[PDB]
Design a protein around this nucleic acid. Structure first.
Ligand SMILES: [K+]
Ligand SMILES: [K+]
Ligand SMILES: [K+]
Ligand SMILES: [K+]
Ligand SMILES: [K+]
Ligand SMILES: [K+]
Ligand SMILES: [K+]
Ligand SMILES: [K+]
Ligand SMILES: [K+]
Ligand SMILES: [K+]
Ligand SMILES: [K+]
Ligand SMILES: [K+]
Ligand SMILES: [K+]
Ligand SMILES: [K+]
Ligand SMILES: [Mg+2]
Ligand SMILES: [Mg+2]
Ligand SMILES: [Mg+2]
Ligand SMILES: [Mg+2]
Ligand SMILES: [Mg+2]
Ligand SMILES: [Mg+2]
Ligand SMILES: [Mg+2]
Ligand SMILES: [Mg+2]
Ligand SMILES: [Mg+2]
Ligand SMILES: [Mg+2]
Ligand SMILES: [Mg+2]
Ligand SMILES: [Mg+2]
Ligand SMILES: [Mg+2]
Ligand SMILES: [Mg+2]
Ligand SMILES: [Mg+2]
Ligand SMILES: [Mg+2]
Ligand SMILES: [Mg+2]
Ligand SMILES: [Mg+2]
Ligand SMILES: [Mg+2]
Ligand SMILES: [Mg+2]
Ligand SMILES: [Mg+2]
Ligand SMILES: [Mg+2]
Ligand SMILES: [Mg+2]
Ligand SMILES: [Mg+2]
Ligand SMILES: [Mg+2]
Ligand SMILES: [Mg+2]
Ligand SMILES: [Mg+2]
Ligand SMILES: [Mg+2]
Ligand SMILES: [Mg+2]
Ligand SMILES: [Mg+2]
Ligand SMILES: [Mg+2]
Ligand SMILES: [Mg+2]
Ligand SMILES: [Mg+2]
Ligand SMILES: [Mg+2]
Ligand SMILES: [Mg+2]
Ligand SMILES: [Mg+2]
Ligand SMILES: [Mg+2]
Ligand SMILES: [Mg+2]
Ligand SMILES: [Mg+2]
Ligand SMILES: [Mg+2]
Ligand SMILES: [Mg+2]
Ligand SMILES: [Mg+2]
Ligand SMILES: [Mg+2]
Ligand SMILES: [Mg+2]
Ligand SMILES: [Mg+2]
Ligand SMILES: [Mg+2]
Ligand SMILES: [Mg+2]
Ligand SMILES: [Mg+2]
Ligand SMILES: [Mg+2]
Ligand SMILES: [Mg+2]
Ligand SMILES: [Mg+2]
Ligand SMILES: [Mg+2]
Ligand SMILES: [Mg+2]
Ligand SMILES: [Mg+2]
Ligand SMILES: [Mg+2]
Lengths: 50, 89, 106, 68, 80, 245, 50
RNA sequence: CAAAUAUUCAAAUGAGAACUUUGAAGGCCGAAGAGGAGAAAGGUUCCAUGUGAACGGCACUUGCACAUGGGUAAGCCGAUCCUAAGGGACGGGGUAACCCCGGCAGAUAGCGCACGCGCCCCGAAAGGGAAUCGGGUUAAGAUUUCCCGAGCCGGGAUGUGGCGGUUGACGGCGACGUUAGGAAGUCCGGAGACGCCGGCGGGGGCCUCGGGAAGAGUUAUCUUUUCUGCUUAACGGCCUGCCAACCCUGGAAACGGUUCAGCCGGAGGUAGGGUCCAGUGGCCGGAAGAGCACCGGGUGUCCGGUGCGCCCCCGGCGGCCCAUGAAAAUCCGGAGGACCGCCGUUCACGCCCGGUCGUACUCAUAACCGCAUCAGGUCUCCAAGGUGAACAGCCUCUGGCCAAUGGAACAAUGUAGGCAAGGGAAGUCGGCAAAACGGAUCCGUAACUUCGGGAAAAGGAUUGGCUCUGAGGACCGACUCAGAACUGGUACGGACAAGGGGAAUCCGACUGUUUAAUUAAAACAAAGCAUUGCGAUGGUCCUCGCGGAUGCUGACGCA
RNA sequence: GAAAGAUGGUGAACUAUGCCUGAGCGGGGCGAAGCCAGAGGCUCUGGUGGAGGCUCGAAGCGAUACUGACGUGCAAAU
């Protein structure tokens, strides 16, 4: 809701930062196996139960 | 007029049986009656709740019967208490 | 016809959320929130209203917010007892006191 | 906001240290003198043309004067 | 409608009571007749004994309008 | 089977009494020196209704015996009490309706209510509307008194126990037919969660000893031992007789 | 209170009032209005943001 | 890939347009909406720009997708403070320990000015409650946070002026009035602070009728016409003073006063004269300088009428209860008068300060839950014109929408909706389904009955349009109701809306309840009737134990 | 490869019931007490008034029938 506890807002901010694409230069590193984020979440799917 | 025998009990329609309506009639009448106030001398005492009888104008509130201001035993008790008080002297 | 909305996040028609419709200089209708109707001071022996004092919410009677003439009545038991109650107490106080002297003499 | 009725009481209020500015508003009926003080804005209505001028000239020289 | 058109039995959907309640009619009659009685007690057209008798007859549904009430007052005063 | 309804009431979960709008315990003022040796005058200020209680209560104000303070009491109102009335409590109080007296001061035949069982109980007997106790006899040797309770039982009480003179107000309440399930619903709404009772024969055997069968019937005597375990003790408990005489 | 004391000790300017908020990214943002006789454009030039 | 009526034309953009954008047209939601805003829940879905694929069950140039950035401002709105049902918990008690017990009273852990007094916390963004208004502003905020202007509250210091000293003010017969106008421990009252139902009255907003002026629409004919707008906040001062309540004079039967209803009066009416109370009332300030509408800076922002109208609030009566319908914080007043003099001052003006967290957006036929962009489910506020009894149905204005893959053709069988000569239940287990009835006005209405009903029983007649007529009022007006003439292809509650009736048997008295997702019933409940136990060292019941429920109870009670 | 048995834990966001504190329910029909008047000598007549776990019905709440549609549904109950 609009009415938020601070602790809920702080957690929501971290989850907002975490669902980004991986930087392109990570794939260029010497021994790299990472392809995608594997932890992207869309709000309409996969709700975070807070 | 408007009724030959029901009176105040006609609010109940055809329900509950004739004997029960006749039973409740006397208490429905008596609990909605206006009683004489001995303190001020007016017929202004009305039931506020079961056992509670308040005068409209002088404002006295009196503990009495459930559906009538003075019960029959209340008069008898007062006479017994009065006779005991005098004979005690 | 210019339907209205609540202006705060109270969404329920409670007694503390009562509104009135006003016309603004902008030519529109808005809601203004009113104060709940309050009883004034009451007399404990007659139950009648205490004359001379306005009917406000309790915190609107605060000294910093209300003038002193509005708060008080100039008589013993001013805002507490009505005039009829004060007259009866004065007469009762004097007449019973005389009876105490008469009991002492007799 | 408060209204002032007599001219002299407006004179003392405009002479108050906390008075900041005087605004003169011209209407089709009268001339309004408004002095901005610390807590209130005081308005005096002058229905006479020359009394408005005499008030204009007799204002304290230290107070700012604005035409509206 | 003011001239009276479109007000026949083929145009009425509510009951006569639902259209204009009998209580509203009775309230208007009492206020009209009680005002007239008060207007006659002042100006001394009737005295307080006549007013009290007419007030209880108005409440008793004896006069259906003003013209009936004034006629009764005139006939009542016609005694001597 | 499962726990029967009679057993579940002792947990007091949904069966606790409804007391949210009650005005406080009704009882005498605590026994003290003034009452023990003289009289103390209070004034009745209100006669009020207590939810769940048939009898009206009387609000009474005393002056504290040794503190500069008011003392406000609330007990069951005797019939005939009224606001602005002076009531007197103590050994030397007059035998008048509404006064509180020790039983030693009430002669034989007196009508009393809110009678103490122990000295200082503040009233234990004859408290429901229209009820009263009768003073039967006095024993000066043992200092005991014999009273007759509303159920008819005789009881021996110390002569120092206090009672109010008169009968409880609000009598005649149960002579009026309720006439409606809804009137019964309102009566018990302010008392307890007890009113709509389902017959044990209308249940399944898992829920009640009377339950089951292809006809609604108890199937065994409804009289039950005094020493039966809970869950088994249903019907008529330790009945000396049954039927209508 | 610490914000207006900090801007005074950092830039030698006086704040008339401070409005703060926490952004959806989790950081705190402050709106610092300077008193008249302080020109934010001049202060912005000294800091380097313009 | 078929529920929720529906699209069409021209243009633009683009590789590509039935689906994007603009304009025009035709339609729908119809203001208890498909409109405008909130509480839960979600968490960036909000805004901009861009577009490889995937996804948006057809398509897309397009987005609730994807990528990169941006966006949520408070002394006054909330949380926060208080307590509710309730929860935790010191000591103590129990318990192998985990843990279970709060009234069982334990030197209760402290409060004012040595002296005096002395009967824990959590729990509500719908309960209680310090204080804000109007106008403007963004791509995205502010339905009171930013800007402009104008206020208020709380706290803290400090003057200047006033006010009092018959130490602690005046006036009034009085109700009471005046911006000020002593005081400690102690004590007392009020406000906060309360149900449901029914009339009546008042205020605000809306609707509605008229006049004036401004602009727009129609204009073969008619139309002094149709449409739109013509505004005024918190806060401060003065006035007014409803309905009740109160005061002074006076003394009432030939009783009077009085409401829609009540009801009121020697315990003092009617009457005369006053006090107070509230207002969302009037005027002025705020404030025309704003906003709006026009004309090219300028003009204007005005005058009335009406009401069983609708929504909100208030007032004052009446009714109802074996039902009587929170508490605390907080604030005000009062009784008393110890103590005190150049010291008192609740007065005006003046000075300083005001923390933390929330604030975007959706709130639903796509932002929540139902594995989904699911015809389901999910708490609220506002709410126009016509018809009409009416928030019924049907049509329309504001606002919002044409999103539900599209095109061609009309086979069988379906699904949904109709009609059908003559007969009229012969159909079928069974009139299942359908049809018939239906509004209003007048007439008329049986058996039986617990005398209240049955009853809208049954059975008949009428209803449009037009031109009039009569009656019912206030200090010029509004609806209602009766009557008449004329007149139409006998049609007229012209759509919509809207009982089929009667004669009996069984069961259940009735109203209520129930097997969520095959049984709504004759089952359950119920009032009434009857029985049993119990006087507290008690009955009934819970608990491992300690202890506990009934019980804030006491036989008109509990079980 | 059971249907079961046991030990120790988690749920009253559905539903059941008690409690506290909020919110909500057009317009009509019938017409009980109380009250007024008239006539008669308490009765009859006309009004007034607005009761009721009364009635037709809008919102809401529910779910009788078609044993309708659907029955790899829009839906694990529409
Ligand atoms: K006053
Ligand atoms: K068991
Ligand atoms: K129950
Ligand atoms: K039963
Ligand atoms: K059985
Ligand atoms: K705040
Ligand atoms: K709160
Ligand atoms: K409350
Ligand atoms: K305000
Ligand atoms: K916001
Ligand atoms: K949805
Ligand atoms: K076909
Ligand atoms: K047949
Ligand atoms: K016990
Ligand atoms: Mg979801
Ligand atoms: Mg999970
Ligand atoms: Mg009507
Ligand atoms: Mg069974
Ligand atoms: Mg068994
Ligand atoms: Mg299909
Ligand atoms: Mg389409
Ligand atoms: Mg439609
Ligand atoms: Mg339409
Ligand atoms: Mg929106
Ligand atoms: Mg968007
Ligand atoms: Mg596709
Ligand atoms: Mg995204
Ligand atoms: Mg903030
Ligand atoms: Mg606030
Ligand atoms: Mg506390
Ligand atoms: Mg508690
Ligand atoms: Mg312990
Ligand atoms: Mg708290
Ligand atoms: Mg609140
Ligand atoms: Mg916004
Ligand atoms: Mg009623
Ligand atoms: Mg007078
Ligand atoms: Mg003005
Ligand atoms: Mg202008
Ligand atoms: Mg409404
Ligand atoms: Mg004093
Ligand atoms: Mg509404
Ligand atoms: Mg109409
Ligand atoms: Mg409608
Ligand atoms: Mg579809
Ligand atoms: Mg097709
Ligand atoms: Mg046929
Ligand atoms: Mg036939
Ligand atoms: Mg056949
Ligand atoms: Mg056959
Ligand atoms: Mg057969
Ligand atoms: Mg049928
Ligand atoms: Mg019949
Ligand atoms: Mg038979
Ligand atoms: Mg039944
Ligand atoms: Mg039923
Ligand atoms: Mg159910
Ligand atoms: Mg079922
Ligand atoms: Mg069924
Ligand atoms: Mg029987
Ligand atoms: Mg196995
Ligand atoms: Mg086994
Ligand atoms: Mg629950
Ligand atoms: Mg009537
Ligand atoms: Mg009903
Ligand atoms: Mg019904
Ligand atoms: Mg069936
Ligand atoms: Mg089927
Ligand atoms: Mg099929």
């Amino acid at each position: 809701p609009s009415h938020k506890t601070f602790r809920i807002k702080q957690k929501l901010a971290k989850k907002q930062r975490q669902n980004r694409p991986i930087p392109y230069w990570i794939r260029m590193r010497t021994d790299n196996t990472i392809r995608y984020n594997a932890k992207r979440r869309h709000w309409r799917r996969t709700k975070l139960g807070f | 007029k408007r009724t030959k025998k029901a009176g105040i009990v006609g609010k109940y329609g055809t329900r509950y049986g004739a004997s029960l309506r006749k039973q409740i009639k006397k208490m429905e009448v008596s609990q909605h009656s206006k009683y004489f106030c001995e303190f001020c001398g007016k017929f202004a005492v009305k039931r506020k709740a079961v056992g509670i009888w308040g005068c409209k104008d002088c404002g006295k509130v009196k503990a009495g019967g459930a559906y009538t201001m003075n019960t029959a035993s209340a008069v008898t008790v007062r006479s017994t208490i009065r006779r005991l008080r005098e004979q005690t002297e | 016809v210019q339907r209205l909305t609540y202006r705060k996040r109270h969404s329920y028609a409670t007694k503390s959320n009562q509104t009135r419709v006003v016309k603004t200089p902008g030519g529109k209708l808005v809601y203004q929130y009113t104060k709940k109707r309050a009883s004034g001071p009451k007399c404990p022996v007659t139950g009648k209203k205490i004359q001379g004092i306005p009917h406000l919410r309790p915190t609107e009677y605060k000294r910093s917010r209300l003038s002193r003439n509005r708060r008080t009545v100039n008589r013993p038991y001013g805002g507490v007892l009505s005039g009829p109650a004060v007259r009866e107490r004065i007469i009762r106080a004097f007449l019973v006191e005389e009876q105490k002297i008469v009991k002492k003499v007799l | 906001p408060k209204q002032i009725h007599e001219i002299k009481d407006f004179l003392l209020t405009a002479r108050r240290k906390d008075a900041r500015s005087v605004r003169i508003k011209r209407t089709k009926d009268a001339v309004k003198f408004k002095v901005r003080c610390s807590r209130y804005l005081y308005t005096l209505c002058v229905h006479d043309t020359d009394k408005a001028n005499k008030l204009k000239q007799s204002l304290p020289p230290g107070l700012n004067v604005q035409e509206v | 409608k003011q001239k009276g058109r479109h007000s026949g039995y083929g145009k009425r959907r509510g009951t006569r009571e639902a259209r204009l309640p009998t209580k509203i009619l009775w309230m208007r009659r009492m206020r009209v007749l009680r005002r007239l009685l008060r207007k006659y007690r002042e100006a001394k057209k009737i005295d307080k004994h006549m007013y009290h008798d007419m007030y209880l007859k108005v409440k008793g549904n004896m006069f259906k309008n003003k013209r009936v009430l004034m006629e009764s007052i005139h006939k009542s005063k016609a005694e001597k | 089977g499962r726990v029967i309804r009679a057993q579940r009431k002792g947990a007091g979960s949904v069966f606790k009494s409804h007391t949210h709008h009650r005005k406080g315990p009704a009882r005498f003022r605590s026994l003290d020196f003034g009452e023990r040796n003289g009289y103390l005058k209070g004034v009745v200020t209100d006669v009020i209704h207590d939810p769940g209680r048939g009898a009206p209560l009387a609000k009474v104000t005393f002056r504290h015996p040794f503190r500069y303070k008011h003392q406000k009491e609330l007990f069951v109102a005797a019939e005939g009490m009224y606001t602005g009335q002076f009531v007197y409590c103590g050994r030397r109080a007059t035998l008048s309706v509404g006064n509180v007296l020790p039983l030693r001061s009430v002669p034989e035949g007196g009508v009393i209510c809110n009678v103490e069982h122990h000295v200082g109980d503040r009233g234990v007997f004859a408290r429901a509307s229209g009820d009263y106790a009768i003073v039967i006899s006095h024993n000066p040797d043992n200092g005991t008194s014999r009273i007759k309770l509303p159920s008819g039982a005789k009881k021996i009480v110390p002569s120092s126990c206090r009672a109010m003179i008169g009968q409880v107000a609000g009598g005649g309440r149960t002579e009026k037919p309720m006439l409606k399930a809804g009137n019964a619903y309102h009566k018990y709404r302010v008392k307890r969660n007890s009113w709509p009772k389902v017959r044990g024969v209308a249940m399944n055997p898992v829920e009640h000893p009377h339950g089951g069968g292809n006809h609604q019937h108890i199937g065994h005597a409804s009289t039950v031992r005094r020493d039966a375990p809970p869950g088994q003790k249903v019907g008529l408990i330790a009945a000396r007789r049954t039927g209508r005489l | 209170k610490k914000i207006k004391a900090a801007v005074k000790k950092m830039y030698d300017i006086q704040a008339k009032k401070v409005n703060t908020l926490i952004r959806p990214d989790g950081k705190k943002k402050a709106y610092v209005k300077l008193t008249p006789d302080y020109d934010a454009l001049d202060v912005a030039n000294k800091i380097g943001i313009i």
